[PDB]
C-alpha cells in the first residue's frame, strides 16, 4: 500500500549521458547509436541568445568545434546537422550502452520521468507532466540544458523531452527529440507567455481513485452529476473539459473500486466548490494533477522494468 | 530555478538488485560482492509470519534451497548466514556491477532514495524520509520486500534501508543493511505501535529557505522568536524540538538568503498559528518535511554523481 510520485528507474538514460562542449558553452547530451542530439543553442554565447540567426552562427562552426565527452572517454564529432532546436553530432562511435529506443512527441497531460543533468553528469530523478500550456514545472539550474523526459515500457526507453530554456516566469520549456518545441516557444532569451495553465481533469480523477484504492474515502458522496453539468463547474475553475476518452481511461480504475466516473466527478464538484476543509488526500492538502490513468495502474498493480 | 523532490539516479542500484527465491517465497536482493542481502522472512511461508522462529526455520534450508537470479545469470549459493533480521546468501560469483559502497545506519528526519522492485527488477525511484519515529510513507506492494533505500555522494552509495513489512495502519518499516530494524518493529504478522509522528522542523525550515531562494516569500515577516519562544510552539503542533546543532546545519541557507534562522523560525511559528490562508508554497499547501538542509543546498548548487 501507499501511493508516491515516483520516476521510473534512470540506469537506461543515464549510459547515454554526455557533455557536449562549443565554445564557451557547454551543456548536456543524449548518445543514441552513432549521433549525439542537443540543444542547438550550445553554439550561441549569452549575446547571442538575445537574438540568434542559428544557421549563421552554425556556419561559423566545423565537426572539430565540438567537444562531446562520456565521462571519460572522448567522441570524435565526424558529421553535424541542425534538425529544428536540435544539433545532431554523428560521432565515430556507436554507444556501446545505447537502450532500446523511440523518440516519441507526447501529449499534454501525459507524465514522464525528467533526468538532471550538469556537465554531462546525471544529478536526480523526478516525475513531470506536460502542461496542457505545454510547459513544465520542473527543477533545471544553469547547464542542465539538454536533460531528458522519458518513459520506460519493458525494455523501450520513449525520449519526450529535451530540456531548452526557463522562461522569465520560472517555467520550463523545451523540444521533442526532433527539436520541435512544445507549445509557442522559441530558443531565443525574449519574454515569452505561456498562456493560461489549467489542471489535468483526467489525472486528478485518477489520483482520486489512487486515493480509494488506499483508503482516503472522506470526499465520497452520496452525489452523481452529468458530463455537461460537471463541466461547467470545471470551465469555472480552469480545469481541462472532461470527454468520453477520459471516462473510457479510467474505466479498469472504475471497476476495481466500483465507483462510476460520473460518481467520482461528483465528488470532485464538490471538492471544487467546498475545498478540501483542512483534510487532506494522499498527504495533499491541494488535488494533484501529475498522476496519469497509466501511472496509477502501474504503481497499484506494479509493473517492472526489464 | 524550481524546486522538486527528486530522487538520486537508480543505475548504480539497478545493477545490483536480484530475486531471491527460497520455496514458495519471493522477494528482492541486494547482490554486492559475492553476497546477496535479503530478508530473512523469504523463509516463512504466510502462517510462519505469525509466529516465526527463525533459527529453527532456518535450519531446514541449506544452500541449495536459495535460488537467486539476476535477470538472466544463475548465481549459486555457496554459504547462508543470518545477521540480525536480514539474511547474507554467500555467493560463487562477486557482481561485476557492483559499485563503491557503504552501509549506513541514518538518523531520524534524514532523506534517501527508494528504489521499489518486484521479481528483483525495478519498477521506480522516489524519495524518502526517516520519519522521527523510525517509520516511512513509501509505495510498497506485495513482493517489493527486500527493496533498499540509499544515498549517493559521488562515486559511493550508501546504502541505509531495507524494505520488509508493511504495518496494520498502512506506514513501512524496515532495517539497515546489517538487519537492524529501525525503530521497535520486529518481522512478525503482528500489531505494532509506532507511536506519535512528529514534524521534521529542521527540515521545514530548509524547505521555507528553499522557496525564498526561488521567490516564494509572502510568509517572511518581521517578527522575530527565541529558541524556547519557539519550541513552545513547535511543542504544541508536535513539531521536532529545534536545536542549536539545528541552527548550525541551517548557516549556509541562513548566509545566501540573508535571513536569520530565528527569523524564518518567526515565520514558521505565524504559518503554525495561521496556516497558509488558501495559499501555497513550491506548490505545496501543506508544510514540507521531505528537505533536510543538505538536500536544498545540493539542489540549489546542482551538485552531480560521477
Same mark, same amino acid.
Given at each position: 500500500?501507499?501511493?508516491?510520485?515516483?520516476?521510473?528507474?534512470?540506469?537506461?538514460?543515464?549510459?547515454?549521458?554526455?557533455?557536449?562542449?562549443?565554445?564557451?558553452?557547454?551543456?548536456?547530451?543524449?548518445?543514441?547509436?552513432?549521433?549525439?542530439?542537443?540543444?542547438?543553442?550550445?553554439?550561441?554565447?549569452?549575446?547571442?541568445?538575445?537574438?540568434?540567426?542559428?544557421?549563421?552562427?552554425?556556419?561559423?562552426? +566545423?565537426?572539430?568545434?565540438?567537444?562531446?565527452?562520456?565521462?571519460?572517454?572522448?567522441?570524435?564529432?565526424?558529421?553535424?546537422?541542425?534538425?529544428?532546436? @536540435?544539433?545532431?553530432?554523428?560521432?565515430?562511435?556507436?554507444?556501446?550502452?545505447?537502450?532500446?529506443?523511440?523518440? @516519441?512527441?507526447?501529449?499534454?497531460?501525459?507524465?514522464?520521468?525528467?533526468?538532471?543533468?550538469?556537465?554531462? +553528469?546525471?544529478?536526480?530523478?523526478?516525475?513531470?507532466?506536460?502542461?496542457?500550456?505545454?510547459?513544465?514545472?520542473?527543477?533545471?539550474?544553469?547547464?542542465?540544458?539538454?536533460?531528458?523526459?522519458?518513459?520506460?515500457?519493458?525494455?523501450? @526507453? +520513449?525520449?519526450?523531452?529535451?530540456?531548452?530554456?526557463?522562461?522569465?516566469?520560472? @517555467?520550463?520549456?523545451?523540444?521533442?527529440?526532433?527539436?520541435?518545441?512544445?507549445?509557442?516557444?522559441?530558443?531565443? /532569451?525574449?519574454?515569452?507567455?505561456?498562456?493560461?495553465?489549467?489542471?489535468?481533469?483526467?489525472?486528478?480523477?485518477?489520483?482520486?481513485?489512487?486515493?480509494?484504492?488506499?483508503?482516503?474515502?472522506?470526499?465520497?458522496?452520496?452525489?452523481?452529476?452529468?458530463?455537461?453539468?460537471?463541466?461547467?463547474?470545471?470551465?469555472?475553475?480552469?480545469?481541462?473539459?472532461?470527454?468520453?476518452?477520459?471516462?473510457?481511461?479510467?474505466?479498469?480504475?472504475?471497476?476495481?473500486?466500483?465507483?462510476?466516473?460520473?460518481?467520482?466527478?461528483? +465528488?470532485?464538484?464538490?471538492?471544487?466548490?467546498?475545498?478540501?476543509?483542512?483534510?487532506?488526500?494522499?498527504?495533499?492538502?491541494?488535488?494533484?494533477?501529475?498522476?496519469?490513468?497509466?501511472?496509477?495502474?502501474? /504503481?497499484?498493480?506494479?509493473?517492472?522494468? /526489464?
Amino acid at each position: 500500500s501507499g501511493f508516491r510520485k515516483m520516476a521510473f528507474p534512470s540506469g537506461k538514460v543515464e549510459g547515454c549521458m554526455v557533455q557536449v562542449i562549443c565554445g564557451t558553452t557547454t551543456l548536456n547530451g543524449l548518445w543514441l547509436d552513432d549521433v549525439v542530439y542537443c540543444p542547438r543553442h550550445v553554439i550561441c554565447t549569452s549575446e547571442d541568445m538575445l537574438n540568434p540567426n542559428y544557421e549563421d552562427l552554425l556556419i561559423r562552426k +566545423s565537426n572539430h568545434n565540438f567537444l562531446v565527452q562520456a565521462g571519460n572517454v572522448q567522441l570524435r564529432v565526424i558529421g553535424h546537422s541542425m534538425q529544428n532546436c @536540435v544539433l545532431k553530432l554523428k560521432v565515430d562511435t556507436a554507444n556501446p550502452k545505447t537502450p532500446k529506443y523511440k523518440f @516519441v512527441r507526447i501529449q499534454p497531460g501525459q507524465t514522464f520521468s525528467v533526468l538532471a543533468c550538469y556537465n554531462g +553528469s546525471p544529478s536526480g530523478v523526478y516525475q513531470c507532466a506536460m502542461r496542457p500550456n505545454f510547459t513544465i514545472k520542473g527543477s533545471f539550474l544553469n547547464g542542465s540544458c539538454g536533460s531528458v523526459g522519458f518513459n520506460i515500457d519493458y525494455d523501450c @526507453v +520513449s525520449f519526450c523531452y529535451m530540456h531548452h530554456m526557463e522562461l522569465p516566469t520560472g @517555467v520550463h520549456a523545451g523540444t521533442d527529440l526532433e527539436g520541435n518545441f512544445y507549445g509557442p516557444f522559441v530558443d531565443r /532569451q525574449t519574454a515569452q507567455a505561456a498562456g493560461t495553465d489549467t489542471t489535468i481533469t483526467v489525472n486528478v480523477l485518477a489520483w482520486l481513485y489512487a486515493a480509494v484504492i488506499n483508503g482516503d474515502r472522506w470526499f465520497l458522496n452520496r452525489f452523481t452529476t452529468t458530463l455537461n453539468d460537471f463541466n461547467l463547474v470545471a470551465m469555472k475553475y480552469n480545469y481541462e473539459p472532461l470527454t468520453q476518452d477520459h471516462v473510457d481511461i479510467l474505466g479498469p480504475l472504475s471497476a476495481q473500486t466500483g465507483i462510476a466516473v460520473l460518481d467520482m466527478c461528483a +465528488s470532485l464538484k464538490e471538492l471544487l466548490q467546498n475545498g478540501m476543509n483542512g483534510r487532506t488526500i494522499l498527504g495533499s492538502a491541494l488535488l494533484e494533477d501529475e498522476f496519469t490513468p497509466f501511472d496509477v495502474v502501474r /504503481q497499484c498493480s506494479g509493473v517492472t522494468f /526489464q
